[PDB]
Every structure is written in C-alpha cells, then in structure tokens.
Amino acid sequence: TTIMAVAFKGGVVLAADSRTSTGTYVVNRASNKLTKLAEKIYCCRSGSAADTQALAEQTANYLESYEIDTSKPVNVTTAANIFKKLCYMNKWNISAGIIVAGYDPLNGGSVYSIPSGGSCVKLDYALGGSGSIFLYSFFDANYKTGMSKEECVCFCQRAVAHAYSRDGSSGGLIRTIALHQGEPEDMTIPWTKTPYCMEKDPKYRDLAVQNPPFSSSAKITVNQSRSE
Amino acid sequence: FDKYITVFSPEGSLYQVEYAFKAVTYAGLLTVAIRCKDAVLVFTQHNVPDRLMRPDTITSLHNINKDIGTCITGRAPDGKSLVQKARQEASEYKYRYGSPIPVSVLAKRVADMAQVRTQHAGLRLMGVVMTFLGMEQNDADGSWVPQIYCVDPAGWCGSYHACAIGKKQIEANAFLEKKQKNAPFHTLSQKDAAMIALAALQSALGASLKATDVEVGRCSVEDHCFRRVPDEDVEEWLTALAEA
C-alpha cells in the first residue's frame, strides 16, 4: 500500500494506490483505501484490510452518534482520538497504520498519523504503508509548504506513482480526495495515465548489457539478439 | 391495587396506561403532522411563557439520525429519554445491518420499548406520544415516500395521513377530517397542506399564530433530511392563510 495526506491552506488532500495483495498475487486491483468517517473527515487505511475496515466502520458509527447529540459537525481531532484509542486498545491483535485527515471550521485542514502501536501525531503531511519508505526523500527534496489545492492534488498523484513504481506491493489506480470548506472532490487516475512509471521513463528504455555475444574482444557493445 | 401497578383491572383495562395518556394532555401543547405529495411536515407549539428563557433552546423537534425526526408531545423529559433510546436503537441497527434504520422499523422498536413497561412492574411509563417523520423507499421502483408514525404509551404504533396530538387534539383532528373530504392530503402541495395544518392549530388553540409560536420540521423527496423550516418560509404560509 502507499497512502498519504497533505495539508494545504484551507484543506487536505488524501491519496492512495488501489492494490490489495496476498504478498505475491493481487486479489483486488481496485480497492478503495480512502474511507469516509464523516462528511469532511476521511481516513487512509493500510495494513490488514479486515482490521482497518472494522476500525473505520466503528469509528464512523461513533462520530455519527456524536454529531446528532451535539448537533454540530465534528472536528478532526475527535475522529483522530476515537480511532487512536481503538488502535491502542487493540494494538497486539491487529496490523493497522492509519491516517485521519479532514476539514473542520475551527482548525481548518488537519492530518494525524496513527501508526502501528497506536500513537497519534499531528502533522503537515503523513506517509504510510509499505510504499511510504520510498517517499520520505521525495518529500524532503520536492515538497513545499504553501501549495494550493491543485498543486497538492497533482503532487500527491505524482508521489503515489513514484512509490508504486518501485513497490511490488502497491499499484493500480491512484485515488485522491480533497476536503475543504466546499464540496468533497474525488479523483481516480488509471494506470494508463499515471504521471510516472519506469516503463515510460526514457532512462530505462535501453536494456542493460547482460548478454553480449561471444567475441574476440573484451569490448562490450550490445546484447546478442539473434543466434549465430 | 390495580391503580398503582401493571395489573389488569376486572374489565381487562390497564390503569397506568390510561393515566400516562392523561400526562399527554396535561402538558398543555398541541402538535399537528401532515403528509402531502412530496413531503411530510410537522407543526408543534413553541411555548416560551417566560420572557427570560432563551427561545432557541426550547424544542420538541429532534433528529433521531440524519433522515428521521421526532416531535415529542407530553411530559417533556420523558420525551428526551425516548429520543436517546431511539438514537441508540438507530445506531445499533446501522452497525448490525450497515444501512440506516427505516422510519417504519424505528417506530416499531420504540413501541416495543413502551409495551415492555406496560407488562413489567417497577418502571414508570413514559407519558408521551412520539411522532416519527421520514422518507421510506419502496422496493419496486425505488421511489421515496413520506411517512408519519405515532407511538403512544400503550406501545401502539400506527401510520397516519395527518394527526393532531395534545391539548384540544379532539377539536383539531375533527377540523382535519373536514378538510380531508375536499381533497386527499397526498395530492396537495407543501403550501396547501401547510395552510390546513396551521388553521387546525388556530381553530383549536383559539388564537392567531405568529411564526415565533410554532416550530416546524420537514422531510421531502428533494431533500430527505429532517430539517427545521426557517421562520421566513412559515411567515409566507401564515400570510397566505390570513388572505384566503
């Protein structure tokens, strides 16, 4: 999996790849890892799908009850704390890494990481899943504060694509969603329009010279293509 | 000895149930709900007797969830207890089946909660009539239909085209019976149904209403959510009625 969320001024963007795998074989190539928790709060799920589906469903059930009582839209910090507690109480029984992000009028766009073990950290961006370890340096090198909604969607799409081109365990579609004072905006990019893959990157077009012909010179030139 | 607990009298009647029904009128308020072509409306009295009360805190209308609203008639804090159990019921139903409770089924569960206190001893009955309002989907074509259900202290659950509950309900229900004969409620516009309901109140209370005196909720085909109707949209109904 590769999940991430990024804050921009006024909102957040959440992004994810679309693959569910048993290790070597893809059982679903079109999952939806961006799960809705309330009108403007979503989470990005990584780890066991069974666990993170059950905890998201449970977190959503609690927040809908709380919003009816209070009669108010719910703040991101509430979503994050409810989830966190579920992730902490069950830490030994699950495999889950979660990102909760959202928009609310009191604190704007916010992002919480809730990794394995059930800590909860409030950030400007968060990465998660197996594919995350390829993006730290990407973000360190290329990410900036101050990005608009449109810059941030585009940047997320390009990060996911970099991750999933090198991570065997990520791949497929790129889904995003942008949450802000206006209406939720979702987007799905098919693999055939991905902004990056190694298959289309010109520095990987020409093949390594692993198979030179039997020759009378130590000079290396081209791969042998036809029998002698 | 039967006047004090859940036992049958010698005529097979339950006395605590009958007295719980008196609690309902004792509270002094009138509610009218009415189902028209595309919507369901509920019109309750908003009494703020005290000049020092914050009037936006006095309410009989509540959401049970996004799509279901209630109007409490009777002993108010017994009302709010049922609002909380209804909310809990709705939330459990959704976690168990993964879809929001239909208003017909909600009402039946609240009725069962009442019935149980008519049959066990030691817990007082709730002296309310809960009117539930919401849109229900038909299985056939997938269209959405407005409903009104009332549950009473006996645990009875029934659906209505229109109904008045509370002080002077007898006089107001007769007024709606008369105006049913002209045209069925399910053929009316929101505005036309409203003029009937508001005049049922004015007839029965023996007054003239301002917008501040009523609170009004509404579910419609256009917007399934139960929502309060703003004061301006009610002034335009009350103006339409003073004229015609």
Provide the token pair at B112: 């069962």
Q: What is the dihedral of CA A150, A156, A159, A161, to 10 degrees?
A: -90
Kind plus residue range of the DSSP H or E element containing B39: strand B39-45
CA distance, residue A104 to nearest chain B CA (Å): 19
* B14: DSSP letter: B
CB contact under 8 A, B95 and A61: yes
Residue A15's DSSP bridge partners are A4, A176
Rounded to whole angstroms, how far apart are CA atoms B200 and B192?
A: 13
From chain B, pick out residues whose CB is under 8 angstroms from the CB of A61: 91, 94-95
Torsion of CA A44, A49, A51, A57, to 10 degrees: 60
B241, containing H or E segment: helix B231-243
Interface contact B94-A57, CB threshold 8 A: no
Nearest CA in chain B to A57: B95
- The residues of B whose Cβ lies within 8 A of any Cβ of A are 63-66, 87, 91, 94-95
Residue B3 carries which DSSP code?
S
CA A97 to chain CA centroid, nearest Å = 11
**Which approach determined this entry?**
cryo-EM
CB of B137 closer than 8 Å to CB of B143: yes
First to last CA, chain A: 46
Q: Are residues A112 and A126 in contact, defined by beta-carbon separation less than 8 angstroms?
A: yes
Give dist(CA B191, CA B70) in Å, integer.
21
Q: Do A65 and B94 touch (CB under 8 A)?
A: no
Give the C-alpha separation, B227 to B219, whole Å: 7
Burial class, B121, CB count within 10 angstroms (exposed 0-12 / middle 13-18 / buried 19+): exposed
Report chain B residues whose CB lies below 8 A from the CB of A56. none
Report the residue of chain B nearest A55, measured CA to CA. B95
Q: What is the Rg, in whole angstroms, of the alpha carbon atoms belonging to chain A?
A: 21
Query: Do residues B128 and B153 touch, judged by C-beta distance below 8 A?
Result: yes
What is the crossing angle of helices A49-70 and A76-89, to 10°?
Answer: 140
Phi, psi of B14 (to 5 degrees): -110, 115
Pairing of strands B214-220, B227-228: antiparallel
Interface mutation target, options A59, A63, A64, chain B, most CBs of B under 10 Å: A64
Give the minimum alpha-carbon distance from A168 to chain B in angstroms, rounded to a whole number.
34
Instruction: Give the Cα-Cα-Cα angle B110, A37, B138 (nearest 5 degrees).
Output: 45
Interface test with A, best of B64, B66, B88, B95 (most A CBs within 10 A): B95
Element (H, E) at B71: strand B68-74
Query: Among this protein's residues, is A1 annotated catalytic?
Result: yes
Nearest to A174 by CA among A71, A29, A63: A29
From chain A, the residues in CB contact with B64 under 8 A are 68
Give the Cα separation of B110 and B118 in Å (integer): 13
Cβ neighbours of A57 in B, within 8 Å: 95
Q: How far is the C-alpha of B191 from the C-alpha of B36, rounded, in Å? A: 9
Residues of B whose CB is below 8 A from A68:
63-66, 87
Picking from A61, A69, A71, the nearest residue to B94 by CB comes out as A61
